Write a protein that binds this ligand. Structure first.
Ligand SMILES: CCCc1cc(C(=O)[C@H]2C=CN([C@@H]3O[C@H](COP(=O)(O)OP(=O)(O)OC[C@H]4O[C@@H](n5cnc6c(N)ncnc65)[C@H](O)[C@@H]4O)[C@@H](O)[C@H]3O)C=C2C(N)=O)ccn1
Ligand SMILES: CCCc1cc(C(=O)[C@H]2C=CN([C@@H]3O[C@H](COP(=O)(O)OP(=O)(O)OC[C@H]4O[C@@H](n5cnc6c(N)ncnc65)[C@H](O)[C@@H]4O)[C@@H](O)[C@H]3O)C=C2C(N)=O)ccn1
Ligand SMILES: CCCc1cc(C(=O)[C@H]2C=CN([C@@H]3O[C@H](COP(=O)(O)OP(=O)(O)OC[C@H]4O[C@@H](n5cnc6c(N)ncnc65)[C@H](O)[C@@H]4O)[C@@H](O)[C@H]3O)C=C2C(N)=O)ccn1
Ligand SMILES: CCCc1cc(C(=O)[C@H]2C=CN([C@@H]3O[C@H](COP(=O)(O)OP(=O)(O)OC[C@H]4O[C@@H](n5cnc6c(N)ncnc65)[C@H](O)[C@@H]4O)[C@@H](O)[C@H]3O)C=C2C(N)=O)ccn1
Lengths: 268, 268, 268, 268
């Protein structure tokens, strides 16, 4: 009734109540969307997280590394939303790099099989999902994934940054494909957010010293950002994903909206 | 009922029914916004043009080069909206480069007095409007200005491109100020759009090679644009401006949204 | 007498007399550099090809996907240059994407095992060579890898473009490591160059539309390039690589130099 | 005899012995260049600074704001270097923004006439000098100006940043012109350097508190930079300008080499 009114949207990436995907979905439903959810290997767990949302939604299994799951995803989605119905939107909210790729180990010690899995889940799957779901999206429709700005190097995030860089590259090619169906493809670049994955990634670890470093991030980002940033509130990010899912950005595709308080636009 | 319900927005830059400001305004009103309009020097023209908008809005004189128009702008707006009310939106849609600064006249032959005036009108004025209107805007407010991608050089557009490069820089500073009031400041980079002036120009009003170069760019644009581009429909651009004026992009500032068909993301 | 007098540099990636590595090497020797060469799998080929260089240089086997070749690389180089000597330069000029990842095969149809191998060879390997050779490089040393601008998507190049996006990211991390040894790490973004493989490809070895798309890009390139571009002369590119290997760009790292005719700076 | 050997180069922008232009010139002469110098209104003063260089060089007056000076510059340069001789290189090392545009006053309080002069001297003059000197440059030749990265906002530099943004835009157009003469146009982006202009600009002021802020800059940049940065040494910057003046970057034009220790490539 208020933004995503009448729209049918698939949302992946819910693992905890802190998941950004969790907040995408809540906000999406507040704005009137019928959701299909997608989840990984704790189906038990996430189903329990899922019923805490404002409305009911089918929950499907998707191992983005599983060629079978992907191959049947369009069919399983259709049974959930009704034959003769298509999707209007798709949220890719998936990330993974093994620890060996992240603040722990030095950059050079991440083995390639590890980095490869990371890139598989974090960049490539954005294309898989497009391949799988694009055949059942409506014209006017929207695909959006979650990104962070990898344009400069930083401590800790290491191969996850590399993976995001690739993600941004994949998104411009996906958009050429999506364009044939009248569908947009975009990334949202968030500033940092205190999801359980984040507070875990690092700090812990590197180093150990700190979940006070998590606090320092939060304070520093809020400083850099002209309109401030609150790392504990995923709502501003979720509002941005929702705008891309609406009809209000009808001419933007293959890019990156930054929902980061404007921090990327300031040197300090 | 809509995107922009209850919002008090000032729109500048309407000169004819084909000005992009004209369609920003049309869309804003359809979306529940109450407007104040600003026009430059043909007020009788702007009066008859703006009478065709879906709802009546007061019209104020503002030459952006006029120190006194700026000094009085806040007062004059407050009169118009009711003392004790403030603006939720400002739209800067003003641009000009003298004839020596565009088209056939060689890049090197633009006199600095011409360049200076162009940058005055085209870049700096985004600061001055910011300075005048922020003392009367509400937190959560939005300032949006019109841009086009100047990261690469091109034929015909010449000093106007330089003007836009500066504007993108100005916008980043204005965001730091607007932050202090809880106000965002962003630009929309449009694709080429067929206004009166652009048509005359492609018609060869600034020489024929300038005209033919621009028509090439226009054709190339739509080809590259993964979702195509329609240079004769300013609506997709107006909707993007409204997206920024709304509460649904609350964490973007100092930034540029590309309402351009995805074109800047494709080499070819 | 010249640019690179007394410098001990390792060059990889020579496969034929038209490999850009081949001309990097030719130019380096003309400029006083003493080389060690690395070749991948047709060593007898690389032997007869590299015998035509202005001076003899030892040739070492290195499959970048081979864990053992990397483990032994530092030892094998030291043998070759004399124990107690170190490298002043490393040139990474290696790239590969399987057939499913380029050309006519649809973007979406590349299997991840093909993409993974491409990124292995094309992006990650820049890390591993860095890891192997930095323990044996001198302060003031220079690592340079071969790139092309992937900031925008394009036809035919597909996953290879993604690979390069990742490489630019990797290069930024490698710079942080190379810093600790007083070593710079930069990439050179070349214009398109007519190697054996590129000619076969423009000849339609990966389908004809891929070929014709690439020839378009090549023509467009030279038109845009303010100083023109000659796709058949890899020398300007080799000189740029040498510029980075020299002491005359001592304060650039984590960075990309565009040896491309100025083309990426012009929309048209 | 060693890099700029045989090359005739104009260098503008010498005001104190701390001037970057001062170090450009010294290094240029160390590498074998015959220089023409250009200076502003303290001809007395700078002549005295000038004789402290390694060799003798004609010194000419150039008020870049003076249309007369510019109009006769090519003629005055020819008499200094010999009829039938052309230049191979041009260093634009000129900057100016009035204080009202810099850390003192708030961003919005800089009047346009002030910002305009700033833009005139800092951006536009780069084109003037090209217009003036391009008719007497050799093919293969090089124009280079000094820039700093304006891509994000920062405290203090305010309208000087805006001016640099415009500078970068002007440089891509200059390159289209220069290209017709076989001449390259590029910018060097330096990290910060303790020239007398810098330590004065700001700190003093804003604020007052500190020339300890100058110290803090220096420490922080050296941190961000993978290879470190020493704000007291202009030699690394001067080496980079010299590389662009050489034949070793023959395919780069309309861009920006960063001589900033790699700081722009790291988020921290
Ligand atoms: C500090 C400077 C570095 C930088 C980094 C950041 C961030 O990393 C921001 C920026 C972007 N994000 C993105 O949101 C997305 C959601 O993350 P997030 O919500 O933060 O964490 P998670 O809740 O744990 O979500 C990950 C999901 O993935 C799914 N997953 C994982 N593997 C499997 C496979 N094999 N099968 C099926 N499903 C899989 C997993 O099950 C989860 O559902 C993700 O893409 C993040 O990269 C999340 C961030 C954060 N701070 O939490 C912003 C600014 N700067
Ligand atoms: C091809 C590569 C470059 C290219 C260029 C383009 C464009 O130029 C696009 C993208 C951005 N724009 C911007 O929209 C804005 C609206 O213009 P636009 O709506 O395009 O044209 P106009 O209708 O004629 O409006 C100009 C307005 O300005 C006003 N103005 C003039 N002087 C005065 C002063 N002294 N005081 C106050 N107001 C001033 C004037 O009266 C007009 O209302 C403007 O900033 C444009 O630069 C206009 C576009 C166009 N196609 O008409 C997009 C993609 N790429
Ligand atoms: C048009 C838009 C995109 C476009 C593309 C281009 C280009 O693709 C340019 C710009 C960059 N390059 C890069 O130079 C590099 C040299 O290639 P290049 O010299 O172009 O081709 P090759 O001679 O065939 O070399 C490939 C080498 O790799 C080696 N290789 C292969 N596998 C192995 C493994 N397993 N171990 C060790 N070595 C490996 C292989 O044997 C070869 O020696 C390479 O990175 C290219 O990607 C090559 C160019 C080209 N025209 O040939 C520039 C501008 N734009
Ligand atoms: C802290 C983050 C902000 C940012 C800023 C910086 C910098 O500002 C660096 C980056 C670039 N520069 C550039 O070098 C150039 C030389 O400056 P610099 O050498 O720093 O100062 P000056 O010695 O005083 O040089 C200015 C010259 O100009 C000439 N000038 C002035 N007006 C007149 C007119 N009317 N007529 C004729 N001549 C004129 C003036 O006479 C001087 O000769 C200049 O363009 C700087 O902008 C000098 C910097 C510095 N730190 O000293 C790098 C990284 N980040």
């Amino acid at each position: 009734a208020g933004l995503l009114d009448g729209k049918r949207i698939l949302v992946s990436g819910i693992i905890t109540d802190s998941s950004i995907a969790f907040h995408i979905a809540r906000v999406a439903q507040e704005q009137g969307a019928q959701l299909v959810l997608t989840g990984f290997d704790r189906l038990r767990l996430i189903q329990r997280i899922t019923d805490r949302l404002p409305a009911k939604a089918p929950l499907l299994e998707l191992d983005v590394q599983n060629e079978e799951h992907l191959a049947s995803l369009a069919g399983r989605v259709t049974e959930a939303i009704g034959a003769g119905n298509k999707l209007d939107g798709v949220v890719h909210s998936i990330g993974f790099m093994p620890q060996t790729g992240m603040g722990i180990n030095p950059f050079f010690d991440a083995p390639y099989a590890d980095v490869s899995k990371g890139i598989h889940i974090s960049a490539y799957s954005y294309a898989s999902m497009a391949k799988a779901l694009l055949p059942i999206m409506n014209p006017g429709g929207s695909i959006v994934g979650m990104d962070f700005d990898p344009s400069r190097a930083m401590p800790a995030y290491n191969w996850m940054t590399v993976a995001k860089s690739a993600l941004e590259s994949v998104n411009r090619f996906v958009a050429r494909e999506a364009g044939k169906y009248g569908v947009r493809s975009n990334l949202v670049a968030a500033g940092p957010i205190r999801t359980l994955a984040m507070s875990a990634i690092v700090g812990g670890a590197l180093g150990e010293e700190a979940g006070a470093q998590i606090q320092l991030l939060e304070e520093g980002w809020d400083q850099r950002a002209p309109i401030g940033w609150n790392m504990k509130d995923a709502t501003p990010v979720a509002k941005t994903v929702c705008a891309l899912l609406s009809d209000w950005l009808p001419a933007t595709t293959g890019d990156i909206i930054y929902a980061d308080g404007g921090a990327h636009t300031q040197l300090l």
